[PDB]
Design a binder for this molecule. Structure first.
Ligand SMILES: CC(=O)N[C@@H]1[C@@H](O)[C@H](O)[C@@H](COP(=O)(O)O)O[C@@H]1O
Ligand SMILES: CC(=O)N[C@@H]1[C@@H](O)[C@H](O)[C@@H](COP(=O)(O)O)O[C@H]1O
Lengths: 166, 165
């Protein structure tokens, strides 16, 4: 009953088309923030630097799946906020508008509980275990492009990884 | 929350990969009968004998996970004393049986702690847990193990390196 998601450097839009499900999104909030030392180091920008923050509800066939909050350097991508009016896929926007392509990412997987707001958005009981993911991605020139923190419904997701003995 | 890269390594290797000292407690070990599910996973006949091993995993002495391992009993004679000997299942597999893991599929999910798990892990019933399953095959292409582990949600995180094909 859970979606089985392969761990791979792919977009939510790509992932849902793999599942044969229709991906839609709801822009919960978008705008600029000032980076603290942590976010500055992750995006290789000067402390105090401006960060585009994008928060989206990701749905599969109209049902809430996850809330994703993505962070990118506003200085590098000043027209990206506006460009997302035209693109549903962030990765597609980066490729077509800025010729930026992701090459490597580190993804972290943890579990914890949703905030009251998240639980309301996802339609889950607030006591439901959730899958808390982060993704730190870099492009083909080795520059960090995004830092993403996400909350995936614990009752709808499992992740799958292929392991190899080195 | 302590980090741990997803790759085909043992608990022992992963712990020594950090500065953490791995210890385990053997909770139980015994034979069960395989249902169709397990029989398929281990490539034995339904009704076949499976060795189930239950271990408590500690990092620097603090309880971290309960790990339940399933293997074909017929394939691994004297596995119990061999596990006592080497402590690492993977070391035992290599040294005793000349069995070497080549590939595995790992599943990562959430769950809630059962009363048994909460008691063993010194935590609360209903604490969010990370539930990981590993299905591994050896260099002959044969499945070796099917493992299910429950990690304290407040103490563990798993890390994966992604690269675009
Ligand atoms: C790691 C994670 O939880 N989600 C990633 C996220 O890092 C990325 O920003 C998004 C872009 O999807 P889009 O191109 O469809 O907007 O795809 C994935 O879902
Ligand atoms: C959920 C999982 O992947 N558990 C793996 C398990 O499949 C594997 O049998 C175990 C081996 O460790 P050991 O040699 O006993 O120290 O390492 C665990 O981490």
């Amino acid at each position: 009953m859970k979606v089985s998601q392969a761990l791979q450097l792919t977009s939510y839009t790509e992932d849902m088309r793999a599942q044969g499900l229709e991906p839609t999104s709801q822009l919960l909030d978008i705008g600029y923030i000032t980076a603290d030392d942590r976010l500055a180091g992750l995006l290789d920008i000067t402390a105090g630097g401006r960060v585009l923050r994008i928060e989206r509800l990701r749905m599969a066939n109209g049902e809430p799946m996850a809330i994703e909050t993505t962070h990118l350097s506003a200085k590098r991508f000043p027209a990206l906020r506006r460009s997302l009016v035209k693109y549903t896929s962030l990765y597609t926007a980066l490729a077509e508008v800025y010729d930026v392509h992701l090459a490597e990412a580190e993804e972290t997987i943890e579990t914890s509980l949703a905030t009251p707001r998240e639980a309301g958005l996802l339609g889950t009981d607030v006591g439901l275990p959730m899958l808390m993911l982060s993704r730190h991605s870099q492009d083909r020139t080795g520059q960090p492009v995004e830092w993403v923190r996400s909350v995936y419904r614990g009752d709808r997701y499992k992740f799958v990884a292929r392991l190899k003995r080195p």
